[PDB]
Ligand binder design. Structure first.
Ligand SMILES: Nc1ncnc2c1ncn2[C@@H]1O[C@H](COP(=O)(O)OP(=O)(O)OC[C@H]2O[C@@H]([n+]3cccc(C(=O)O)c3)[C@H](O)[C@@H]2O)[C@@H](O)[C@H]1O
Ligand SMILES: Nc1ncnc2c1ncn2[C@@H]1O[C@H](COP(=O)(O)OP(=O)(O)OC[C@H]2O[C@@H]([n+]3cccc(C(=O)O)c3)[C@H](O)[C@@H]2O)[C@@H](O)[C@H]1O
Ligand SMILES: Nc1ncnc2c1ncn2[C@@H]1O[C@H](COP(=O)(O)O)[C@@H](O)[C@H]1O
Ligand SMILES: Nc1ncnc2c1ncn2[C@@H]1O[C@H](COP(=O)(O)O)[C@@H](O)[C@H]1O
Ligand SMILES: [Cl-]
Ligand SMILES: [Cl-]
Ligand SMILES: [Cl-]
Ligand SMILES: [Cl-]
Ligand SMILES: [Cl-]
Ligand SMILES: [Cl-]
Ligand SMILES: [Cl-]
Ligand SMILES: [Cl-]
Ligand SMILES: [Cl-]
Ligand SMILES: [Cl-]
Ligand SMILES: [Cl-]
Ligand SMILES: [Mg+2]
Ligand SMILES: [Mg+2]
Lengths: 696, 696, 351
């Protein structure tokens, strides 16, 4: 009848065994206080999901087991079934596993059967899928575990648990949406509870597909579904957004946070198993298509999941899943990201080159949002967060209440004007900093620039001129770039010495402000301020950035943003001749951010090369453009793209948000020395155009 | 009786279909002129091996076929069997394939059955292995091919080719390295000739493994074995080093270049099939197993490998494989990789910061080596090299004979001294430049440094001091780093404007000079000159570098190097107080380049975390060090490594040389925000140390 | 690229071969006027789904074939692929089938693999599920059909059609919600269009589950989904409420009536196949869990589903499915029921 189960989101850290252990323990202790008899944790939670090439290392395996032993001998784990994740090597093959134990015995080790090998995922690099479906083998335990557990071997493979009162089965992360998912046969076999341990990272706007899936599955097959997921940054450019859930028969009973500053969040629910049994009768109490397939092996477990609590235990009522707006998503994720980055880097704060333009502004807003979250958290009684703030600012007695106050201690904004900067942009940056609370620095680079160009003249005997002073296209560009790069040099100097100049220990993380759209076209200066330490908006669309900044006005009460939004998007690096005004980035690029986004998505999402893309747009923009015209747009896109790709190889690491990122380290593997005339492809395009231009 | 076969190495280029088509045609034409009736190409040669995520694009598939259709309708391919590679989608699964055609008819498509998923390889990201052994399906041909070939379908799978006189089998690359390789069962079923198309890249010293393996195989199994490989840079960090070979019954019959400036290099041999047959007939255990061997599907082909060429057509005689010394390898690999960048980037030359030290010196030697190579190639009658040069140099009449004259056209060294630089280092740089013939630039950064520091003072009211002037540790470092990044600002300014100042069109690629040992430890300044466009020595050991440079003294007649070798490895950026001499980078790092090299190899090559590494060293350095000491060495390494790993994320792409490269984009994936205290792991280490101190 | 397909709801009548034929013809004629190159009809539409114990009767089989012959020799069926349903006995075993023909040839006969045996359904009483998955056998045609079609045998079993431009597959009624549905492997194999012929009867309030399913399926696997269903009373206490639909990539493009007094209702839609191909790339352009299962047999069909019409043919835009309130459901179904009862009973009225 009535059972009480727990799932959870943990902020795990790659190879951080000590912390990882304490987090797992805490969740189990929490679940037990709430009356749970089964606890589900995230995929590979013992070592942290993102260990990458450390999985090749045997030490990883070893410590994981030492962590497992600690769990097994811990008095908290008594009388609750615990499903943890670690790597495990069986017969010289490395598997991504679930280790399920109860009262100092291992019940079953259950290896993953479908591995993620797309986008940021590459599990086949380190793990093998279990291929012997509906079968188990005897796994031989480490003497370390034997001595403790008093078992020689345990079942290893595709099996389910049978207890005195129920039948629980495992579905690991992506097995949930893999063709022919375990949950189908488990359902058929009569499995009433299905646990899914995830490690899925944030992706702007796609939170609902996870929820929908679990929902549909429970709706279609009946049953309780448990989903646990990592939450936070585990040591790289991903943010895991654990929307841990508990679903039954198509309804949701517990909704876990997508972004929060909690290291441990536990969901429970009290459900009557008979609701499953009667909901399944409601559908098909009959037989099926006559399948006669090999049935699931069964691990007998001497334990009752439901135990006497009924007399008081309130049944969980169904709930509606509340989603975040896309702007709320943006204001929360990169924000919580930046918080883990700061706290785990053990760095003294951030250094933000603030230009008075939209992106640098958005970046500033993310920090302010971070501060708010921290204040919220501290108010909420979050000891970990309080501990951390106190450690970051060095003040034992400190207690952030006003976000502007915390911000000041944590953020240093820096406006670096050139000879041609307007008074307006300088002002806007000054105002925005004033409003969020940051320590603002305003300086002029021109003395350093004059000096560099002096060195050049001194040695070549030649003086480059700006385009407006009769300079060549090359000279103009070079000059612009020098200023860009001097800014970067200065940014790092302050990162390294500004706190020093204020009488205080420590150094700052440099933050970048490239957006995903310009990153793709390479419309940036190699090694200017586009290269920093971390970039939180690197993966966000320009349009979304504007959207996010306009949303910040009212949510954070920052009026300084209006002028910033209204101002013309221009880079004041070159003097303006009489009769003309500044050129906008969109004219500079030779395409609007809108249409740039389309190329982006057609390229990475829809997997189109130039010919394919030419054909798509030809129809999409059939009214607006002519065949010759789209050819030119596409050609212009691919050439600029290819010419600039090398800029991508060295680009600052970015929070992952859009599934159309051009990021080269993990998500978008590509050449960087292309033939930039695309002779063959472009010829195909021409032929098509010529063919169409034969119509009357 | 006698058959004439060809294999080759092509300098393919990712997505360069036009180019790739022309090079394949050339190989086939060269093959025919030399009398071959079979021609084998490299792995995925139509599209070029390294298209990475473009493999997801239908356009890659489509254009590959268009190339194929071109090959099929081409007169040159008449009466020679052609083994060509491309990706194929079959039943909506994407495979790495060989396509064998003859006289406008596709004979068979052979999919790869084992993929490479380690190191720089990750075929599983985009392809699936064919897994039905000795089995075949019908491939439905694209309409375009049908209209040309008048075929509806062709066999797709694990099949062999039967001619009137022989039986030909395919082994694709990594299949040769798998435990139960195809060549075993193939040889037992009477396949006489085995063809292997590879696409494997350079690794210092590992050339013999490929040779020994193919030789062993034909020795153990009998038969002729052909290997083809890409040669050169196809668009990324890798150099494919085509050691294409022909081997029979354990002897080599043709050895292809490892590094050469040739786009197309064809090997042919004339062999007697009767030698194969009698070699096999002499192995009793083989024959006992061959009269019981499981059969391969055979595609019957109306063709004779041995024609009316028999008339005294001279049988090929056995040869000894000649190898390169490790220094010759270094002298030739990155050199060719550099030529390929220069010509395929359509850039006007290189800009090399030259410090008067070993590594930058090495980089200079590579460029000179390249120059010699180009000169040698031109003297050989190589028309594409001569064209390529004239294009780079914009003078259609130019003929590089002297290596020093070419060098001055395409290289620009740049010495950049600080206030503290010594006169010696200046002169070493200058003397090296004179001797290789580069255009040398000598300047002082001090004016620019003062200007930047003046900016900092104007805005903070504080002035940083060098440690020798009582500055703090941080001040001293900030100061050193500033100078360092200023050098980078200048480097790019000259890269962009130096030719302009000399009244010449174009720009330069900036070369880096980070070695693989410093890259590992993070012993470099983020965004100093460590950050360039490409780094030809970023994957090479400090010890190999010295060895290389010392080799260059006699090989290239460059005496300036001796002083460069003999001089103390010091970075003159800070002033030294008297009573004290300048600190070497080895005491700066806190470890010798030697012990560093060991950490790096134990790390990547032996897959070792800090506990494992401590254990290994403890035994290795048992005489030299005490366990307490070993722990400190290991902890210091791991500490430094992980505090600095972020420097890897934005670091300049390096030519891949060692298999212990710490490169983060492809070869060595790792997190970049570690818990740098390594609590768990260091605890385990201290436990062992205590345990060892108590007992004895 | 652009194709035009048709599905339909028919008011079929058990054993009413004459009428059943004329209804099928009419739908095909309508589809052709609308430019369709493939037409999908309901489950067992030739004999009418509700024949019950008449399925034991060989006459049923016979007339069905005589009806099939009439379809085959009819000039209306020219240049459109027609998927009709009849019972068919292969090797002395009775199967509930799809007969797909084009220009007086049978392309493939495709038998049901999961049979409904719950509530009002009892298909196992008369039919056997096809159990040899991913396999076909040579079905020997009746001389009646041979003479007309000039074919000795045709493929019988679990197969897909491959045309010059696309790949079409079959999912019969309840196979849509049976564990391990054909649409999963068909998707994997690259089937771009999936036809589902239904005979599902009205059930108060449960209309959305049909729509949701088709929707979710196309959303999850990509592809065009076609669903046809009987509509009206076929001679007993059931009302079939054909919510025939056309779905693609998770959106609905055509919504058929649940209750109407039409004997024939045809849905069409003009869709670009490349939307499927690019929507599937959007999800997983990679590989899967490494399944290595026996793949679908392929019937080669010398026909192009898309033919030159593009230059004028408007692409169908997505629509929202409009449901009836429960009271509207009540006011319409039993109502349309009573109408067929009155008209087919040949009675003078009600008391
Ligand atoms: N295939 C290849 N592989 C490796 N390297 C390659 C290469 N092709 C060129 N390179 C090299 O890469 C280097 C590129 O860097 P660099 O020479 O500095 O120039 P680059 O970064 O290419 O040009 C900077 C761009 O930024 C834009 N801009 C201007 C002003 C402000 C802003 C702003 O929004 O902040 C942007 C401007 O319009 C310009 O197009 C060159 O040295 C070039 O030789
Ligand atoms: N976990 C983490 N994730 C992301 N970023 C992190 C980080 N931890 C620190 N950071 C940040 O990274 C930045 C590091 O750069 P920076 O502050 O400039 O300083 P950094 O590059 O760390 O220090 C330079 C090193 O180069 C050596 N050096 C000196 C003189 C000459 C030479 C030579 O051979 O050329 C070398 C010197 O001994 C020193 O150890 C800092 O802003 C820091 O806050
Ligand atoms: N005036 C400025 N002050 C501070 N940072 C700037 C300034 N201008 C540009 N940046 C930085 O440079 C990048 C944008 O380049 P630009 O478009 O030329 O303004 C972003 O990373 C900014 O943070
Ligand atoms: N005096 C110099 N002149 C030119 N390049 C230098 C100089 N010193 C250092 N570099 C560059 O900086 C890196 C080495 O740093 P360092 O060890 O401090 O000399 C290499 O990439 C060198 O090319
Ligand atoms: Cl052990
Ligand atoms: Cl069992
Ligand atoms: Cl400090
Ligand atoms: Cl802006
Ligand atoms: Cl803007
Ligand atoms: Cl100090
Ligand atoms: Cl120019
Ligand atoms: Cl040195
Ligand atoms: Cl040295
Ligand atoms: Cl008959
Ligand atoms: Cl087939
Ligand atoms: Mg902006
Ligand atoms: Mg050196």
């Amino acid at each position: 009848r009535k059972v009480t189960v727990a799932t959870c989101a943990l902020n795990q850290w790659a190879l951080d065994f000590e912390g990882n252990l304490q987090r797992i323990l805490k969740s189990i202790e929490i679940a037990k206080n709430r009356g749970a008899r089964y606890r589900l944790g995230p995929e590979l939670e013992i070592c942290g999901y993102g260990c990458w090439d450390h999985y090749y290392e045997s030490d990883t395996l070893l410590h994981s087991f030492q962590v497992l032993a600690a769990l097994l001998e811990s008095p908290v784990t008594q009388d609750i079934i615990c499903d943890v994740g670690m790597p495990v090597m069986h017969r010289n093959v490395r598997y991504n596993c679930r280790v399920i134990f109860l009262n100092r015995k291992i019940l079953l080790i259950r290896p993953k059967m479908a591995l993620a090998n797309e986008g940021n995922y590459r599990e086949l690099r380190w793990f093998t899928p279990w291929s012997r479906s509906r079968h188990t083998e005897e796994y031989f335990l480490p003497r370390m575990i034997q001595d403790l557990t008093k078992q020689e071997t345990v079942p290893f493979g595709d099996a389910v648990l049978v207890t005195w009162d129920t039948c629980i089965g495992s579905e690991i992360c992506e097995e949930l949406w893999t063709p022919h998912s375990p949950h189908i046969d488990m359902g058929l076999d009569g499995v009433e509870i299905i646990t899914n341990a995830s490690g899925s990272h944030h992706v702007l706007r796609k939170a609902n597909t996870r929820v929908d899936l679990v929902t549909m599955v429970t709706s279609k097959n009946g049953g309780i579904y448990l989903l646990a997921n990592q939450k936070g940054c585990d040591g790289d450019r991903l943010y895991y957004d654990g929307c841990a859930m508990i679903a039954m028969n198509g309804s949701v009973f517990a909704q876990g946070s997508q972004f929060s500053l909690d290291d441990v969040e536990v969901l429970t629910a009290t459900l009557d198993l008979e609701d499953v049994r009667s909901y399944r009768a409601e559908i098909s109490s009959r037989n099926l298509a006559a399948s006669r397939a090999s049935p699931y092996p069964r691990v007998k477990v001497d334990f009752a999941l439901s135990c006497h609590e009924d007399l008081l235990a309130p049944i969980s009522e169904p709930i509606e899943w509340k989603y975040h707006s896309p702007e709320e998503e943006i204001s929360l994720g990169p924000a919580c990201w930046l918080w883990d980055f700061l706290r785990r880097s053990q760095q003294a704060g951030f250094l933000l080159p603030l230009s008075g333009g939209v992106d640098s502004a958005a970046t500033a807003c993310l920090i302010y949002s971070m501060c708010c979250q921290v204040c919220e958290a501290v108010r909420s009684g979050n000891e970990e967060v309080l501990a951390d703030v106190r450690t970051i600012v060095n003040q034992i007695s400190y207690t952030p209440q006003d976000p502007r106050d915390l911000c000041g201690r944590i953020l240093t904004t820096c406006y670096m004007a050139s000879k041609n900067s307007s008074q307006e942009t300088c002002t806007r940056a000054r105002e925005l900093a004033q409003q969020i609370g940051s320590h603002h620095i305003s300086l002029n680079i021109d003395p350093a620039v004059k000096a560099v160009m002096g060195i050049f003249s001194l040695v070549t005997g030649k003086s480059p001129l700006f385009a407006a002073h009769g300079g060549s296209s090359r000279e103009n560009l070079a000059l612009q770039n020098v200023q860009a790069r001097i800014r970067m040099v200065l940014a790092y100097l302050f990162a390294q010495l500004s706190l020093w100049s204020r009488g205080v220990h420590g150094g700052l993380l440099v933050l970048g402000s490239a957006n995903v759209d310009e990153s793709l076209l390479g419309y940036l200066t190699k090694y200017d301020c586009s290269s920093a330490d971390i970039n939180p908006i690197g993966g966000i669309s320009k349009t979304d950035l504007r959207a996010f900044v306009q949303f910040c006005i009212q949510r954070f009460q920052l009026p300084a943003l209006q002028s910033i939004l209204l101002a013309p998007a221009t880079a004041e690096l070159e003097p303006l001749a009489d009769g003309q005004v500044s050129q906008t980035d969109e004219e500079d690029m030779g395409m609007t951010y809108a249409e740039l986004s389309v190329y982006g998505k057609l390229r990475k999402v829809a997997k189109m090369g130039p010919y394919s893309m030419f054909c798509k747009l030809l129809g999409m923009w059939r009214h607006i453009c002519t065949p010759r015209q789209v050819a030119d747009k596409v050609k212009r896109f691919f050439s600029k793209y290819s010419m600039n790709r090398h800029k991508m190889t060295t680009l600052t690491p970015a929070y992952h948000a859009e599934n159309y990122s051009p990021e080269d380290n993990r998500f978008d593997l590509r050449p960087f020395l292309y033939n930039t005339s695309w002779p063959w492809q472009f010829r195909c395009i021409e032929n098509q155009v010529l063919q169409l231009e034969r119509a009357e």
